[PDB]
Amino acid sequence: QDWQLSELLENLHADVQHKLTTVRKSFKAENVWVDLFNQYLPERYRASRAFVVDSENQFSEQIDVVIYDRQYSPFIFHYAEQLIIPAESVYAVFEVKQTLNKQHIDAARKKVASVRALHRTSLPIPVHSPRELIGIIGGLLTLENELKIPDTLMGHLDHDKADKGMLNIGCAADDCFFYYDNDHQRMQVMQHKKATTAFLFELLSQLQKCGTVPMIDIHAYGKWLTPRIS
Amino acid sequence: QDWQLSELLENLHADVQHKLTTVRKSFKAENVWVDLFNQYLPERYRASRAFVVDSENQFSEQIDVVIYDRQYSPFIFHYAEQLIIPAESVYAVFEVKQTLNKQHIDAARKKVASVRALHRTSLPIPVHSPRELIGIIGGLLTLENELKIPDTLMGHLDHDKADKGMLNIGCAADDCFFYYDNDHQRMQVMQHKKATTAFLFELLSQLQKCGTVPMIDIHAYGKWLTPRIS
């Protein structure tokens, strides 16, 4: 029963997972999630606490966990010891909060909203048309779920897809994960003892369906240095 | 005559090649082949001794050398100190045996057969159609060729393409290498003093023609953790 695919999946990155459960039990956070994501995610992706910036000199607020393209990113900024990432590079943004409740849900929606409100550029490619903008994943990462009734959480998580604050995924470590399905066109909540690894696999699945990074308009950033003649 | 492209090609990764010739002469193995491949192959690929697993909880036997996609692999399992790789990540599988003879050919074909019999998934992409499954390269890596007659080896290597045990490529270090050509639609054997480097270039050429990793169905692995509702 060791060489059971089920067992291999649970044992995958066991150590970082164990760090998260201890934190959950010490509450009964932020850095563990960043660590967790960077272990599970393929090389193309990196996770970090960070601000997001766009080529219109607009900045998000500090985002507890940003997942961005490290491999094909043309630049990432460092002010002091802070990371500032171009919006075009961002795949997902998460709020971290100890507890999953109506208020932190709303707090997550506002952080996600502030990133999606940024302006992202996308060029055409040799001549194809410019690529559709990636749909940025928004979520909430918590240690203890305070909405024990699946109805009392289902309700406060029903948000419209046009809404820029909508949460695509979220987790209460070792307790439950939720996510939005398109086939079903609804939110779905799953209460499971292994919800952290199941949440991660869901995340990998949504990342895989995001789409390829569009071509950044590098001149839309370079215009902050020199003029252009039409 | 040093700055001759011919010489540059022979000098390429000269050290790992020298390790292989010594082993050939000490016989008159496994770790050398893995080292050799990991030096010649581009960053996308990695070679390792490993088991292969599929999302149906089927396992190959231990494969002396697996070449897999390390860059775009969503997960690789580590049981004890053993590597277990999802079948969708596999480009090539090799049997290592001291001598190239009818029996080790058959032993190679059975290992290859066991990996290709695994179930591999492939999703559609945004909506394109799902990508064709990669054609997994199967081979046999040896130190000394015991079929000196090119007719006596040609015969025991003529296998049908529809057969899942068919060997696409193989080598007897510093002696000969064989491979299947599609234009010619047959096997081809080459006896050459520099057969190790020529075998590697043939491998690089087949890898290049494999195709891109299909999109793994991550939920087909994630189902081992949580149910899904249709």
Added chain:
Amino acid sequence: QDWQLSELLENLHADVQHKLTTVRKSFKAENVWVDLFNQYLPERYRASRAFVVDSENQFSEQIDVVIYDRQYSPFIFHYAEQLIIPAESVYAVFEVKQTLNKQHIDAARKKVASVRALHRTSLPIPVHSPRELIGIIGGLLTLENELKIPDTLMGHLDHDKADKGMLNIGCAADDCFFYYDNDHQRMQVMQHKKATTAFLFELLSQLQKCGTVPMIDIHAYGKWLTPRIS
């Protein structure tokens, strides 16, 4: 005014930039440019002093700075301590000279011409047609501009696109950068205090528009080791 996108852009890789300005002031070089490029460029690219070779056993002269694809390159050669790069891997080639004048412009054009005259291969892909050959960027990297009149430099830089010596981009550190625009179908010179970073953003933009590496014909290099039967 610290958290101004303008300031973030200037502060990006500030240290290597500072190394370049000191050299400019010590003249009032080569290694600084290589260092500079390897910090600004995304992971796919690497910069290095090197010779370029093709599958016809032709070699360029030593190129002060080659930008090549390290991620998807199937091989790079090392004679002694010299780097020798297959022409198919080359994105850009630069001459380095202390001063920007008519003679070093001509010297750059001849080095660039010698690389573009090499033979580059390109295969079809599964069956699509073989990819168009990348357009290799040629430039000239200098410390002090000796053509102060924008007319007196504009003139000696007007070359025809069909000419294999034509220079696509160039820089006189912390003074000016030039580049060819297709929309405008002319050369363009920009005299700016921050010309080094603006030059780099222009380079990133041209690299982005280059196209993906064509599929190298590995057998056109492997033919240097073994014969082929038609």
Added chain:
Amino acid sequence: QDWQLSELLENLHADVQHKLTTVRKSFKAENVWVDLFNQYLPERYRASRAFVVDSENQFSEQIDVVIYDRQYSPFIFHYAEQLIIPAESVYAVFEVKQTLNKQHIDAARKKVASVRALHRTSLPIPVHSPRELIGIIGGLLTLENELKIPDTLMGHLDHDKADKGMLNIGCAADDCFFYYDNDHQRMQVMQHKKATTAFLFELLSQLQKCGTVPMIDIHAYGKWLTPRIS
């Protein structure tokens, strides 16, 4: 005047130094100091935020910057994402506070005192006598000095060597650094534009005079796992 030893000294690790000055100007912190120390210090040393623990199951409070021996440390602990360092490994402990004033001086003295009150072991060596315990350096790292009168800071920093809270060194970035001299047997304050680099050289000098790590009594930690018979 570039190749002036004075200039080389100022230019040393210029980039991390620049990060510190920006923070100083943004206040007009913690991570910058750690970054700064890890660049200036030789390989034997590492700096990190951390708790300190002894073999009597006593813990300090969280220490903003601990400098410990990473080379010869037999173990370092990781609770969740927290670093916990055996007291025997500690060379220096620093409080970080935006401003240098009487209250943050006292706050530093209490943190330093809590580390020096821990129990540190030291064995004999083959048979020589057990090494004297290292004298742990205590300091205070700030951005802006609020005691402008050198008398008004001198006074609140005159402490006795027998006191476990005594501060050996401290800095107000790009403004002043203080330190205790044994020859002089007093504190000394230095107000200098380049006070950050001078502070660092003073730190290197005190570290050099600390003494080599004593031999840790590993069984005094191992007793937490198994009993011993006398």
Added chain:
Amino acid sequence: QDWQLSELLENLHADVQHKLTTVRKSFKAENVWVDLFNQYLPERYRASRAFVVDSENQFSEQIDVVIYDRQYSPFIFHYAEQLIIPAESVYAVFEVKQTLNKQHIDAARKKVASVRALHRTSLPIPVHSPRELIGIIGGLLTLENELKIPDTLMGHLDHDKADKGMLNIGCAADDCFFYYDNDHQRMQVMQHKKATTAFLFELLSQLQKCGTVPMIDIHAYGKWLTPRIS
């Protein structure tokens, strides 16, 4: 009860420890022990499967785990993919066997004996006298203990110190560990659930008491290349 020194000690390198327990349970090996040691040991030491060689062209048999000085070693040999270490660099040598029984004890003693029988050199230092030769630690590493009676294992482990096969330390993973005490001048066996971590701390303690690598007589190896005149 998480921030209990006891708990930190048990959690230290928890992952590699877990790998070892699984192997113990799959038996109800070699690579796990090497991995385990390389995580617990300080930077000075490295563990590896290897042959040991001396300057008299004598070789041990293959040693399942050798612990050697990687930091101050002047050379290590690589034949094929095998590691060959000069005897002067060796701190400890271990036999790995699934079960702890009289026969594997004897097999361990014979491997240890073969390494200690090698000739080790030691020069004087500036002029001090040559350093005493390190006492090489010998042990046996197993998964399951088959001598359940502590008298039935005590008996077959009482060996004289003057014997070159004597075992200084050994372990049956998560079950028991033994070691020789000099104060007590006997062997000591400890049966404990956490015997793996306690065994490691005992190993660290013995390594610490070994002594410093003597100065290797480099010319005693160099004589294999050129003559010397007296």
Added chain:
Amino acid sequence: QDWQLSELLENLHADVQHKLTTVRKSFKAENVWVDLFNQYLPERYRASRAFVVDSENQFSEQIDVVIYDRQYSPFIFHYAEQLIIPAESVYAVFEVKQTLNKQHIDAARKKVASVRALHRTSLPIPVHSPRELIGIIGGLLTLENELKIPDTLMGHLDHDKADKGMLNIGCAADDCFFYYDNDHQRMQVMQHKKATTAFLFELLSQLQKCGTVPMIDIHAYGKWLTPRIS
């Protein structure tokens, strides 16, 4: 005859050695020697082209190969892309020249003389006395020896030990190495086909007998930033 200590010694770092022989045959250089040394030398040492500087603001000329203490060095400077090393950190200095003749011998003696003329500091240690200054090894590294008569080279290499230009060691790759012996109190020349590896082992032997880095007077460098009160 493969597992012959003689063979292992010749095979040690075979690849970098092969690079050197090719250069020797292409002459019939500098970077190969640096590479060679960094492969053979233990971790404490690093080799690099560099200037040497002392705390009296004196600089050597550029030294083709400096061997310095990277591990215990408190600082190393970087002007532009040049390395500048404090004299106290230097173990050996070499001139590189294609041919070994009277003139390049004299050229080497002058470079060595210029480094040894620098001022090196050395403090006392807790209170022991200050350590004797390391005896800096001087040598000459060449590809072809033009003094074929061992008398015609013996003569031009007899220099007095008090002379600051004296050469302690040198090599004509794959041809001969010389060195100074104290027992013999003379120079010694050895003509051997494997002279490169024998030269390296001689170098390792002299390095081992150099002595430990003395304690640098860090304030003798820090005085370039701030005054001191006696």
